[PDB]
């Protein structure tokens, strides 16, 4: 039941993260999610003392709700561009139903609880990306 949580500018590669995630036999169901930047550069400002820690509290909760094997969560910071991978979530379990659900849960809580703020470098200047009502409705259904 180990957990990997990393917050940093470094790109990740799903091919490097994956074999560690999928390695235990008893974890027969592996779900990954990757989220990319949606032409303008984005900067993710964050709260450093809290990002790894909130991500760890979210997995702790997921682990009380579902029986999970290895879990990985990677979130980047800094300047990124559309098509760059920003977040990786990897979850394992004995059955597909808990792996998909924990995956979904981890993202919905990440998007409303983890201290990151996107800003967009437009022709008119930086612009804070707006927070969505649909992410709040996604989080509250859990």
């Amino acid at each position: 039941a180990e957990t990997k949580i990393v917050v940093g500018p470094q790109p990740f590669s799903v091919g490097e993260e994956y074999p560690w995630l999928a390695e235990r036999d008893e974890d027969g169901a592996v779900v990954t999610f990757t989220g990319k930047v949606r032409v303008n550069a984005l900067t993710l400002e964050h709260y450093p003392g809290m990002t790894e820690k909130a991500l760890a509290e979210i997995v702790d909760e997921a682990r009380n709700r579902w029986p999970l094997g290895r879990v990985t969560v990677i979130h980047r910071i800094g300047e990124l561009w559309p098509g760059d991978e920003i977040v990786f979530v990897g979850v394992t379990s004995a059955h597909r139903s808990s792996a998909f659900e924990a995956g979904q849960f981890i993202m919905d809580y990440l998007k409303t609880r983890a201290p990151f703020w996107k800003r967009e470098a437009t022709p008119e200047g930086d612009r804070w990306v707006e927070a969505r009502e649909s992410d709040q409705q996604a989080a509250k259904r859990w």
Partner: protein, 81 residues
């Protein structure tokens, strides 16, 4: 002291990244009201209904009690992932 951090829009509007305050406040909400009354910009920064709070790097309700030596952070709804 109590140490207070600010992020994104809130950090911009309050015009500092961090500050210290007299550990004299029963709750986060009490500290919030106090800091908001410091000026019009602070009140605008710190009065939104959607304003989030954290105490020692955990998300908490505004009723959460304070203690000498705590880290408090205010920030707007998050936009990560």
């Amino acid at each position: 002291m109590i140490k207070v951090l600010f992020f994104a829009q809130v950090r911009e509007l309050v015009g500092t990244d961090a500050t210290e305050v007299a550990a004299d406040f029963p709750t986060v909400e009490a500290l919030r009201q106090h800091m908001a009354a410091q000026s019009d910009r602070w009140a605008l920064a710190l009065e939104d209904g959607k304003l989030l709070a954290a105490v020692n790097q955990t998300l908490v309700s505004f009723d959460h009690p304070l203690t000498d030596g705590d880290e408090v952070a205010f920030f707007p709804p998050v936009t990560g992932g």
